[PDB]
Design a protein that fits this description.
This is part of a larger assembly, with chains A (100 residues), B (115 residues), C (82 residues), D (126 residues), E (136 residues) and F (100 residues). Helix content of chain B is 46%, strand content 3%. Chain B is mainly alpha-helical and 115 residues long. The longest helix of chain E is centred in the first third of the chain and has 18 residues, at 35-52. Classes of the chains: A alpha+beta (100), B mainly alpha (115), C alpha+beta (82), D alpha+beta (126), E mainly alpha (136), F mainly alpha (100). The A-F interface holds A 11-12, 45-47, 49-51, 53, 61-66, 93 and F 71, 73, 75, 80-81, 83-84, 87, 93-99. The structure holds one RNA strand of 244 nucleotides. It is classed as ribosome/rna.
Chain lengths: 100, 115, 82, 126, 136, 100
RNA sequence: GGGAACUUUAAGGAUACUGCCAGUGACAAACUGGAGGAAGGCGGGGACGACGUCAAGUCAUCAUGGCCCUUACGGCCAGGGCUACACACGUGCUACAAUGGUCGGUACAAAGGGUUGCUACACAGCGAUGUGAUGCUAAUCUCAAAAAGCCGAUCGUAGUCCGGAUUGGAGUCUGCAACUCGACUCCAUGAAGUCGGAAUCGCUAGUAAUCGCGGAUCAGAAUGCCGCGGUGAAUACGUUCCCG
């Protein structure tokens, strides 16, 4: 009863789905059943920044940043699956957490 | 009736009528009524003389009118004589608890005095 | 006000001075800048020169003053009228 | 048997329609228990009273989100969609009554420099 | 506006009587979005008038509305029909507000019955409009 | 800001970091129920006898580039002027103009 | 247990284009009415601000020409001040009550924050809070009680069971430290205020009005600012005058 949990975090959804698709494709090639990827709710943070150097309270820029999360489950893992997962490259801008 | 030297309203509930006495609020009235077992919705006009005497006995336990006013006056006079910061504010008839005075001190300063 | 579980607050350098005076009996005013120190029962009968931002004003401690801050008897602003 | 989904002001209602006596439960509660005000109860019942079919169907309803008015509107929309799914010939009558339209009105966001969506702070020439 | 003609906003019929007149009266009564309170006030008065004379609530209300309806404003000119009804409801709510009774519903029913016999501040204001129209 | 103010901030940070451990020890000893009232009392006296700059409440957040003491935005560590400039140049990952 | 139906979560797509019918305008650009459709003529909102004007604002974010100080106009420290108070003005909050106040019971959200943090539950306290303890690096645990709403009782038009300023007395918490000068809790007190002149402001639909909820800054300290949802109106004949 060994299950592998993969969590992906990023600031760029196109990157995060590219990485998730690559991981899923590799796992399917190795010969293990996978579940996902499952999109978790996105986090959004906003800021209001005054633009003028001295006094204009109504002159502000509104910025935002988003955090995207993906969840992937691997069930019935073959022996080659794990070593393939550490052989898999790490792309900048996407953070990966693996739990056994 | 007359309680503690005060004519409380006759056609009101007891818990509301007892608040007409200085030094007694809603919480104190509730506590007094619960200590003599009279329902809060009963008006004082359907109260027996014995119940009124019991209420008078309960009321005398707390400071109500003359002692309370005397003690407040003494407390203020002590500060004014000692000359601390609060005493000076009491002397000048200005806000005492750190409020702004550039505007909005009308309760302590009375109506506006033209220049 | 300061929580009762912590006790009153007195500056150590002022506490040492008053304790030394009371162990002795010197009537010399104690010069201090500690407007925030609490007046204790040991303070009664002493003269303390409290700073008020510009000068040191003398205060003679009586029984009625116990429980107050030293700064309440040294006003910092000057006002006489408009 | 038939299914419908209704939406109104962030409220979503799932409606399951069958044939029966007329039982109606919302979130394991009766209509009068769930809705306190009469107009909310009337809005829910409007489609069946219009069709004169108050007695031939049984309803199983769940609903989440929004307030009482939004939830009543969502339930009405879901019932209308369930009836349409059950019989396509009923669509002209319900569309004429106006029940098939999804009301897209929604709360407008607060805007920078304003107290509300449109309200502006008080201003003075003087 | 200046260039366009904006269509009037159609209001839904009252879900209990299917009466746009009753719905408009409820909207006139309602304050700051409290529709339930206005519904209770209006329905209570409609039931009260029904008991104090056994008449249909809708018909009795339309007849009283037509009685308290003006005919002219103020420069004399003929008031369009919608403004007539809008002005009659305002008078009927304003005058009903000033009576002395336990609830707004009872005051509304009482002055509806009073106006049904032509006795009320709304009808008096109507006669005032008649007089000042005779003035012009 | 001025070099004197920046150096003051640096000195206060150094003092806080130096005295961090003993302050926590004394606070734990004060909070200790099992310890004697006397132990807690001398613990409190020692805490009051610690230097003033050891207290974290005297630290003020300043911009990491200019030293400005207003508009800090803990997340980026920069004041509003530098945050605006750098975000609009594109050197902050993930931050974009916000519209909704 | 189980299921992959539904809601939702979130990536990619489809759809709306005067497409169809009728009348008009020139016979064009267009315009008016109807069907279908979730939506019909720009469906709603946001960001994006041409050539230029104001010697407009900022040498105190920063950079920079020139001028000035160099045992001081530089640097360090403790205490005080920026919180003053006969007055005038701007922007707000809370009220003057019955479409309401209080008490008991009982429903329905969205968005956002949490490891120097948020805390289930138990005990102690009238209460702010304290102690023990549990889960959470979070669609998993938590802040968290939504409030207006509905049902029942009571108050009966009174400066009141409206209002909640001011002051007296007890406390809690953050912090080395709440005197000048913090927030909150309890007992007592119970001010003006009866809908406000000349004049003047905002708003055309999920808008105005009203009700609550969250965050940045931040040891502590919002009636301000930036967001979120609940309930939900009235009126537009027209350009004769006011402003641009």
């Amino acid at each position: 009863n060994q299950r592998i949990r993969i969590r992906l975090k990023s600031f760029d959804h196109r990157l995060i789905d590219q990485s998730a698709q690559e991981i899923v494709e590799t796992a399917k090639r190795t010969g293990a059943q996978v579940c996902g990827p499952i999109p978790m709710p996105t986090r959004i943070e906003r800021f209001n920044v005054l633009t003028s150097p001295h006094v204009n309270k109504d002159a502000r820029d509104q910025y935002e940043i988003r955090t995207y999360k993906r969840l992937i489950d691997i069930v019935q893992p073959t022996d080659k699956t794990v070593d393939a997962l550490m052989k898999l490259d790490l792309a900048a801008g996407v953070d990966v957490q693996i739990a056994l | 009736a007359r309680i503690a030297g005060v004519n409380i309203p006759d056609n009101k509930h007891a818990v509301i009528s007892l608040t007409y006495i200085f030094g007694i609020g809603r919480h104190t009235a509730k506590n007094i009524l619960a200590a003599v077992g009279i329902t809060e919705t009963t008006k004082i006009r359907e109260l027996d003389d014995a119940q009124l005497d019991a209420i008078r006995a309960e009321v005398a336990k707390v400071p109500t009118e003359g002692d309370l006013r005397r003690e407040i006056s003494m407390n203020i006079k002590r500060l004014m004589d000692l000359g601390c910061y609060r005493g000076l504010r009491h002397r000048r008839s200005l806000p005492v608890r750190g409020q702004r005075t550039k505007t909005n001190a009308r309760t302590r300063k009375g109506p506006r005095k033209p220049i | 006000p300061r929580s009762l579980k912590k006790g009153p607050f007195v500056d150590a350098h002022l506490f040492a001075k008053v304790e030394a005076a009371v162990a002795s009996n010197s009537r010399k005013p104690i010069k201090t800048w500690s407007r925030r120190s609490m007046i204790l029962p040991d303070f009664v009968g002493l003269t303390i020169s409290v700073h008020n931002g510009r000068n040191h004003v003398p205060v003679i401690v009586t029984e009625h003053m116990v429980g107050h801050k030293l700064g309440e008897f040294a006003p910092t602003r000057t006002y006489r009228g408009h | 048997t038939n299914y419908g989904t209704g939406r109104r002001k962030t409220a979503t209602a799932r409606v399951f329609l069958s044939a029966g006596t007329g039982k109606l439960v919302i979130n394991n509660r009766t209509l009068e228990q769930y809705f306190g005000r009469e107009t909310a109860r009337m809005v829910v019942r409007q489609p069946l009273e219009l069709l004169e079919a108050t007695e031939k169907y049984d309803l199983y309803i769940t609903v989440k989100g929004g307030g009482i008015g939004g939830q009543a509107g969502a339930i009405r929309h879901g019932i209308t969609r369930a009836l349409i799914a059950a019989d396509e010939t009923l669509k002209p009558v319900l569309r004429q009554a106006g029940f098939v339209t999804r009301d897209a009105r929604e709360v407008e966001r607060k805007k920078l420099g304003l107290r509300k969506a449109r309200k502006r702070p008080q201003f003075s020439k003087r | 506006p200046r260039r366009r003609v904006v269509a009037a906003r159609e209001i839904l019929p009252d879900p209990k009587f299917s009466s746009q007149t009753i719905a408009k009266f409820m909207n006139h009564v309602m304050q700051d979005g409290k529709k339930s309170i206005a519904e209770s006030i209006v329905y209570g008065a409609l039931e009260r008038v029904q008991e104090k004379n056994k008449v249909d609530p809708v018909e009795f209300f339309e007849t009283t509305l037509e009685k308290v309806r003006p005919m002219v404003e103020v420069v004399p000119m003929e008031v369009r029909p919608s403004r007539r009804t809008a002005l009659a409801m305002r008078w009927l709510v304003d005058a009903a507000a000033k009576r002395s009774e336990k609830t707004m519903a009872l005051r509304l029913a009482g002055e509806l019955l009073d106006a049904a016999e032509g006795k009320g501040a709304a009808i008096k204001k109507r006669e005032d409009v008649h007089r000042m129209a005779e003035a012009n | 800001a001025k070099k004197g103010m920046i150096n003051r901030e640096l000195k206060r940070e150094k003092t806080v970091a130096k005295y961090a451990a003993k302050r926590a020890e004394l606070k734990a000893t004060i909070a200790n129920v099992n310890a004697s009232d006397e132990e807690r009392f001398e613990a409190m006296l020692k805490l009051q006898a610690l230097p003033r700059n050891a207290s974290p409440v005297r630290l003020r957040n300043r911009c990491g580039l200019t030293g400005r003491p207003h508009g800090y935005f803990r997340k980026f560590g920069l004041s509003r002027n530098k945050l605006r400039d750098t975000v609009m140049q594109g050197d902050v990952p993930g931050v974009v103009k916000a519209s909704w």
